[PDB]
Amino acid sequence: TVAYIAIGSNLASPLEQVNAALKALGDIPESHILTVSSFYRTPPLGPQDQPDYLNAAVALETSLAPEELLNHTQRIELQQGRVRKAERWGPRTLDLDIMLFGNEVINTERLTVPHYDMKNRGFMLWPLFEIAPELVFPDGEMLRQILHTRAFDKLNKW
Numbered sequence: 001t002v003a004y005i006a007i008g009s010n011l012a013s014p015l016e017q018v019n020a021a022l023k024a025l026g027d028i029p030e031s032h033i034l035t036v037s038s039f040y041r042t043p044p045l046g047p048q049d050q051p052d053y054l055n056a057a058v059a060l061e062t063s064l065a066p067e068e069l070l071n072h073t074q075r076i077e078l079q080q081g082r083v084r085k086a087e088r089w090g091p092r093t094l095d096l097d098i099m100l101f102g103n104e105v106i107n108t109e110r111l112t113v114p115h116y117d118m119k120n121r122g123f124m125l126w127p128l129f130e131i132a133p134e135l136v137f138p139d140g141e142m143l144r145q146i147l148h149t150r151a152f153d154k155l156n157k158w
């Protein structure tokens with residue numbers, strides 16, 4: 001099954017956090033990374049005094065069930081998501097979202113797939129379009145069409 005995963009980090013210098021999360025993703029059992037989008041720098045949703053986000057998409061081949069993949073992504077956020085802030089551990093700055101899991105539709109307490117808000121987020125849709133331009137959602141909407149219809153601005157690379 002091909003799962004598409006969104007990575008975001010809003011650390012001032014997020015490259016090494018993002019690199020560590022990609023390494024950890026590739027170490028998930030019965031799984032392996034097929035492709036990684038470029039890294040994009042996007043303004044934060046809301047207050048603009050806040051730090052920019054680094055966003056990327058990852059294609060991961062996996063034979064895990066969806067909630068097992070989620071357990072791994074949540075473990076990775078716990079282990080890698082916090083950077084040492086001199087005298088103490090900083091806030092969580094890394095997000096890992098499951099955007100798609102094969103052609104599955106999932107609505108449980110833990111998991112909504114396709115991701116509940118990705119259709120509104122250029123910073124999710126554009127990196128996904130880089131690695132999967134012909135992508136079709138389970139309901140038959142085409143990724144290309146959603147971008148064409150909403151005309152989100154293209155993103156700057158980090």
Ligand SMILES: Nc1nc2ncc(CNCCN3CCC(SC[C@H]4O[C@@H](n5cnc6c(N)ncnc65)[C@H](O)[C@@H]4O)CC3)nc2c(=O)[nH]1
Nearest residue numbers: 008042043044045053095096097098110111112113115123
């Ligand atoms: N420029 C830019 N601005 C941004 N502004 C705001 C944000 C906000 N963080 C996105 C991650 N936010 C918040 C934390 C919750 S975390 C709660 C819960 O979400 C549940 N969940 C349900 N479906 C899920 C799924 N498909 N993938 C993963 N978790 C799933 C899960 O059980 C968890 O307990 C997951 C969704 N990001 C960006 C960004 O990047 N870029």
